[PDB]
Design a protein around this nucleic acid. Sequence first.
DNA 1: GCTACGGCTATACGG
DNA 2: GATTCGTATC
Lengths: 330, 332, 290, 327, 426
Amino acid sequence: QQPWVEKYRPKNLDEVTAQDHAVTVLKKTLKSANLPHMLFYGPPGTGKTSTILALTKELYGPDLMKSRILELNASDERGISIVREKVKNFARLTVSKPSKHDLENYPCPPYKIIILDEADSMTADAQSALRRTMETYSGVTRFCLICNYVTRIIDPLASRCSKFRFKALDASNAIDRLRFISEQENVKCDDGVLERILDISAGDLRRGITLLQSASKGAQYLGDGKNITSTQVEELAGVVPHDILIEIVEKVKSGDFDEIKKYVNTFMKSGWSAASVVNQLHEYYITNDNFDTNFKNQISWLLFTTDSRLNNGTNEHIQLLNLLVKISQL
Amino acid sequence: SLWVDKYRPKSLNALSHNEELTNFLKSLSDQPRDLPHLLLYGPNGTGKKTRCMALLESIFGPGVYRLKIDVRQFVKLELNVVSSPYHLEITPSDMGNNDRIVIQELLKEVAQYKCVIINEANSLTKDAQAALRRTMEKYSKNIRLIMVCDSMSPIIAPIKSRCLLIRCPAPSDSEISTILSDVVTNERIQLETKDILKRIAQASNGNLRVSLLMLESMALNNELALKSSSPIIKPDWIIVIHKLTRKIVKERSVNSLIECRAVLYDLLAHCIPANIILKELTFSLLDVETLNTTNKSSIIEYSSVFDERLSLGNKAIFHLEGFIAKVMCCLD
Amino acid sequence: NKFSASTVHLEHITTALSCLTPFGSKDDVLIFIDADGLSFVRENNHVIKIQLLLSRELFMSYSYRNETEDHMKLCVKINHILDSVSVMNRDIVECTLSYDGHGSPFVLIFEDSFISERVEYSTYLIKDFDTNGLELDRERISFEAIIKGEALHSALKDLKEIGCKECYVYAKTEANDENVFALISKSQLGFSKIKLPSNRSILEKLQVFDGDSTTVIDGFAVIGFFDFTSFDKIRKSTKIASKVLFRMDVHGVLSVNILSYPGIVIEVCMLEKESIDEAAQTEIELLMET
Amino acid sequence: SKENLPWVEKYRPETLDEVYGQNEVITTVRKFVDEGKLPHLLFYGPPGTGKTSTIVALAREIYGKNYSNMVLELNASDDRGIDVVRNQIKDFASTRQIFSKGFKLIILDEADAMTNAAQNALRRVIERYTKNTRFCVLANYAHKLTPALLSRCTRFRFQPLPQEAIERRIANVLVHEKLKLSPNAEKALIELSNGDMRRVLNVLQSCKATLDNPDEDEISDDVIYECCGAPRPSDLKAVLKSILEDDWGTAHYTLNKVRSAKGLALIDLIEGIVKILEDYELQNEETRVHLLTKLADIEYSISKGGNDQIQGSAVIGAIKASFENET
Amino acid sequence: GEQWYEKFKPNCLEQVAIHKRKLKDVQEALDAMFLPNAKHRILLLSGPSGCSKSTVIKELSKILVPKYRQNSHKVTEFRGDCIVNDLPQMESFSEFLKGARYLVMSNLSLILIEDLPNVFHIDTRRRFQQLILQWLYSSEPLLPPLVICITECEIPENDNNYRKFGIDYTFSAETIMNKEILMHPRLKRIKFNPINSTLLKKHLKFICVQNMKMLKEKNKWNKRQEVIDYIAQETGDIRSAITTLQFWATSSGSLPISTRESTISYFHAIGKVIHGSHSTNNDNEMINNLFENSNNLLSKEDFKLGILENYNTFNKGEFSISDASSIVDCLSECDNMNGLPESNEYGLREVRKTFRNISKQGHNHGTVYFPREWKVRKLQNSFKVQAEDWLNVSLYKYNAVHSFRNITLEFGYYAPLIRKCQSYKK
DNA sequence: GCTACGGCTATACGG
DNA sequence: GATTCGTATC
Ligand SMILES: Nc1ncnc2c1ncn2[C@@H]1O[C@H](COP(=O)(O)OP(=O)(O)OP(O)(O)=S)[C@@H](O)[C@H]1O
Ligand SMILES: Nc1ncnc2c1ncn2[C@@H]1O[C@H](COP(=O)(O)OP(=O)(O)OP(O)(O)=S)[C@@H](O)[C@H]1O
Ligand SMILES: Nc1ncnc2c1ncn2[C@@H]1O[C@H](COP(=O)(O)OP(=O)(O)OP(O)(O)=S)[C@@H](O)[C@H]1O
Ligand SMILES: Nc1ncnc2c1ncn2[C@@H]1O[C@H](COP(=O)(O)OP(=O)(O)O)[C@@H](O)[C@H]1O
Ligand SMILES: [Mg+2]
Ligand SMILES: [Mg+2]
Ligand SMILES: [Mg+2]
């Protein structure tokens, strides 16, 4: 059939949850026709594409959508030539006349929306040609820039476009949506479940939905009919078990380089991810009251540096070994 | 012909080295319709590609292991493609940096639950992943990508969010020794004792492929026989790295640095990845008993700094030579 | 539809639209639609403007059912429209030009019994500036000359062949019934002039005024320094013309009326180069003394 | 149809008297145009300071009813290469006036994003046709311009809009939209805009949208903060106090509470803490260095993505370590 | 009433400002190329600007071409400005070379090609490379001798988008002629060197003695010696030296003497960065001048590789390991700055500062070499071909796929010791 | 019938 | 600019 992520994608603006500010601004500007240029940004999987698609289908309708909406993303070319020719020509084009049915059952605003999703991957050379393009063609065309990092957007474009930030979907934001999806999909879960799912999928709901779907499929294949336990979704996500983490901590406490290296080799043999173990080590060390302030400061900086190095695409084994040696020699 | 290919399992039930992962693959194959995008992360030599093949056979019946090799062309990027029934192979190694265009064209051609397997997804550049983060999300009704990578660290967050994370632990010593015993039972080598298989497993560091290849090499060297004192046929580049480690821990001079640079140039000419070269040099330096704990800590710190520098850099010789110079200064 | 006009002859309108080819080859054009007919206005670099008029009598089913606006304007491209009107013929292809008001494509339906081709073009917003800026002032006309189309077309073709980086316009009338009108060319070969004949067959009329359009003076020469990159924009327009009328005022604005239903009228306007060099005019005058 | 426009486009000044803030530039250009002669201008400054609304108003006031045939405008949205400069600009600036109205203004907006070859080919066009054509250059980055081009261009610097000008423009917008704004909300708008009219206009439009009744309800500070997802000063001060005084656990708990109850981003909190820490005593010179370096590194890491919890812990530890050099 | 580089021009071979060995080898090559046998067909003269690379060919042809010509004197220089009506510019050189091959007997004339066609354009560049390649491989039994004087010069910064490289950086023979032409057995590349100070002083003194009335009239004949010495020591260009001398002599005042500044070569720049400059003892001034005068050479990644491969020449490599570690660490840091000019400045300033605090008198230095990266990339391409062939034969026999990383690491080594070691048994 | 011309085309150059 | 070899000359 369809994946649960695409099956429960919000069709209308009333289904997007916890993005109350931007969605209510869009709903209120639906009644009027003064929608400004928008710059949607936030953590991945927070509901930007879903929100813009819902607004697009609400403003124009399925038939008018094709004739009044242009969508460009990283899958297609978005160079300086593309911005100069395609976007400019589309914006210059007069808005198509809506049919009687469209005017009756849809607001049909006099403007059109150019959706540039994943705009953070666009070069600054191609972002300079959009400045006047989104300004002179403002009363006949609207621009929606979607990105994950506002820093990649040049200052002029950030000033021209309205700044709508999508909040991270934590266990207190998307929990209602996750419970709705579980109830609609007939998923049996224990108490406390879907909370670990939202926590592991920090600042994201698509990962949480995928984890829920995978756990449901595993439970169905098992045939026991019992509810899904927390450890199941923890192992399924890729979270290192607590016993392995405490063994790592104990090896760190005994500041023997050879023992630490051997156990790190065994851990890399196990196949776990460096990011997850680093996050779990952060959660263990920061929360533990036994440590003092100076040690916590130093370990926080070391974990920050290790995560920064890992994000650059480095070897997990070396970074993990260096981090554990640094923690031992602290 | 090769023993690795000779004893490659061709089904989910034939896999007898993960158990729990095999059961999870059965659970995933129970409902082939709702198949999420799969990302296999684990140590090299585990058998992730074999697991993907077995899962595809479970979904698409027999004939998945078929090999319909053909040649494509992109703009002149004429990358070869390995086609199969409901199975396509994409290797980011054959197109570095310029992978975005070719993967876009291949994905749009496949779109036309077809599965396309992109091995070693870590080699994908940040632009190809930027295209894929939307390619997977948009056409998720006619194609299901399954990607296998050693470590998902250089994989962008959106791709890991849209895909499903499945871990493939490396084979354990007892089970890999059992696999070696099955190999030597199917093709008799008349092993003197089973301890040599355990030593081979220990010398493979969880790499079943390495264990099988070295077992075949030793059997061929000993004339289809095995010996308790049979030499371990390690790869040549590992021996060169060990010799370089000995040179570093013995000759602490600038001429020795030039010799080390020449050795590194030879290794790079052998098309050995720079990051793994630095990793093996570091771990071989840590295995030297003469060096004290402070020296080893400095070695690992320099290794981390210089592998980050190599990751954020174009030319690889600079970082390797800098790491060698730093460790040489630390030694004396 | 607000507008709907049907025509049987397509070669005439094809040539009329191809008269705008020497201008921007692939750019936007403005089409004014009124009761008299439809027009085509093209402006390049705000220095030259060309206007083409197609009267109602040219068509056979002109309706203009619009009532809310006296004139209806739409902006479309030129290459696509020229290619559509270049359908030629085998059975007359009756065009069905239509425009259903704001937010509607400028549809060109071609019916040839066996063929039912229909072409639609989306409309661009506006040129978004005051188009009526190149119009000459009808009070300070320096001179007014009429030249046959073939002679001017041959002269422009000759100038194009020899390069003609820059061009000059020389007009002077004498009381001895000897009128001189010629164009100077600053090309790779130097300063070359092309003297048009004084015979009435070529030059029907030449009257050099004194900046008042009423008094005719003799012995005064009006120098017009025009860039040839804009002067060759009407080279092919005069090829299909019978009589060409020249008008230049003291404001440095040239006005050329091209005429071949009362035919087709092509009204073009050109700006004059600033003529930085003072000796350039002096040397042109000295050369014209021979 | 002007009501169906964004507030940043339908509040664009049409005359020089509506361009608030840049009083010196307006007065100088008015003196220039009244005295006839206008030198080649070059407008520089941060984005949204009115570098285009000033030049277009000046062109409208000089060439009344002739803003179209006397002014040629080229921007980064169109090609400005060697061919464009050598053909279009030369043809426009080499022809005589339409009605002898004056000189031909050429507005080159966003001229910083131009190739150096074009910037060098433009200089001789500027100098050789200065009798009947005056060039205006709009650029946000001065280093992108050839030094000779800067030499042959009178430089006017559009400084960030002062508080008084933004307050006057907000008052005009309120009068035109029949809105009510609290003084605290106005100050929050001032601090959020940091010298940018477009930011203020967008935030005001979003606040009016966010109101259930845009007529009988007043835009408060809470609305101004909720519509943009910006941290209130109170939560920033609480975070700073928790990091500076309380232990590592309670500081982390307070940081998580502040970033969760309102959804505030970590980079915004970092910027707020930086701002609140500028007017601090910090007698030791090493504390300033540690704070600036560590906070810049954390901001750079955030700009590339990562684990927000780890980055927040890094912020807390960095601030604590920097303030240990105090004693 | 004309420039002094003319009029006072060489009239015989002795007057030519060229070293004895260079003259003798050029004459030997020309005499070998004029024989009925055609061991060498083209003579690729090269060198810096104004190094007597053109004035010697005419003098040689004055006493060589008539001797070996038939009975029944000068050169046939290619004019790159002749725009033929029915001839594309690419075909101009094609027609030149196709009509210059008829000068063998009774029409013998040396073909001199100093002004090359617009080789910066790729199409005509490869057309010229093909045309000269056809000349070397021509089945013609007899061909006239041909000389291509490629004046090497550092092409300045340009606005060309990519247009590959090589000809966009330098105008050397390697950037115009391809490796097949350079390594061709019938090509003889006689490179030229800047004119030595002795010959420059001799010729300047000859010019001065040929015109001394105005020199003594303007109270300059007594100051002639210092001017000649400074001109001959500042530049190695004969024509530029003569022009500067003429400008100084004809002048009447106290205008400082200035001459064209030579561009620092790659090895020269590496030596300056590593060792220093004897002229200037200020590191900042030297680095700033090096970057201002030649930024097209310090910006390429080869120069950083050059420093990495050549910093082991200081004191034959006996310097402290800490200095080497600092140098390589800073080079890696600069590599980690994506080619910013600041990284280029720092990667040389640090090296020069490090090699200044350890500068010891009486320490012999070694020789330098170009970085060994082209050999490495060629070996890597060969290994790529080997791996591709192994994977191709692997898939054709059995349906087993192997990643290129594993091929490099595991499969590649064991494949011979498995397959060929069992071929023995067969 | 041949012409002088409209459309086609091979193409050196363009950016 | 540094090294090694090589003539040529005062
Ligand atoms: N606020 C939300 N309410 C309901 N579902 C949501 C919300 N945000 C995200 N989702 C779910 O997330 C999936 C689609 O998210 P997207 O909007 O495509 O991702 P994203 O926000 O664009 O982030 P990307 O893909 O990294 S740019 C669907 O499964 C939605 O149900
Ligand atoms: N002094 C001002 N008074 C009132 N509104 C202003 C003022 N300056 C700018 N604005 C508003 O801000 C909008 C954008 O300013 P512009 O002048 O068009 O662009 P800019 O200020 O030049 O910035 P860049 O560099 O072009 S992105 C205008 O359309 C006005 O609505
Ligand atoms: N004694 C001399 N020796 C050499 N050249 C001389 C001498 N006296 C005058 N000249 C002139 O100086 C110039 C030097 O010419 P060459 O150097 O042979 O040409 P070139 O080497 O091709 O210079 P390029 O590479 O085109 S800059 C010629 O114009 C000579 O006539
Ligand atoms: N369950 C198993 N039993 C026996 N051999 C296996 C099993 N799984 C994998 N292999 C061996 O692993 C080899 C392929 O490993 P591969 O998939 O390349 O590992 P990786 O995915 O880590 O690169 C095959 O030759 C096969 O013989
Ligand atoms: Mg998205
Ligand atoms: Mg502007
Ligand atoms: Mg010469």
